[PDB]
């Protein structure tokens, strides 16, 4: 019966210039994540094991498999868009 | 060879009418998740079977175990705090 409705942020306008910097962002939120697991004891496998803790997204994220870095980079613009469209406003500081 | 190092965002400030809509963001981004997953033919299951494509988290935000829901309203922060310390500014408007 679960049928999960995101809300439409396609027509919410950021900064290009923080576009610009989704890899700093999401390789962030990727550094983050990781030092969480491998404080729970996660590791590096080829395989996921929830049995033995092993992960294999558990690697500098610029090894990660291009389409991990794609859904990191838009997980953070969707996170951003959903701020400005809570009626914030994001601007470069000088 | 692998440690994860991620940016001191401790003293990074946000206004608190942003942090108080965090559950909002973090169950956006949850929905956001959840609507990929199932279109990619996941389904709900109590225990997580990549062969079968079975999930616990796939329910509603709201039925998530306190830690997941607390886990994603950290990263939402954690993203926000990120753009701050880059050099943006975050303003109710």
Redesign the interface.
Known sequence: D?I????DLSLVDL?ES?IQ?SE??AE??H?????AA?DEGWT?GEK?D?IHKKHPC???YDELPEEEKEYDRN??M???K??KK????????D
């Open positions: 679960y999960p409705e995101p809300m900064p923080l910097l700093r962002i962030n939120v550094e983050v994540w990781a030092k491998i590096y996921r929830d558990l690697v500098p997980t953070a969707n996170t951003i959903m701020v809570l009626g914030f406003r994001i601007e470069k500081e």
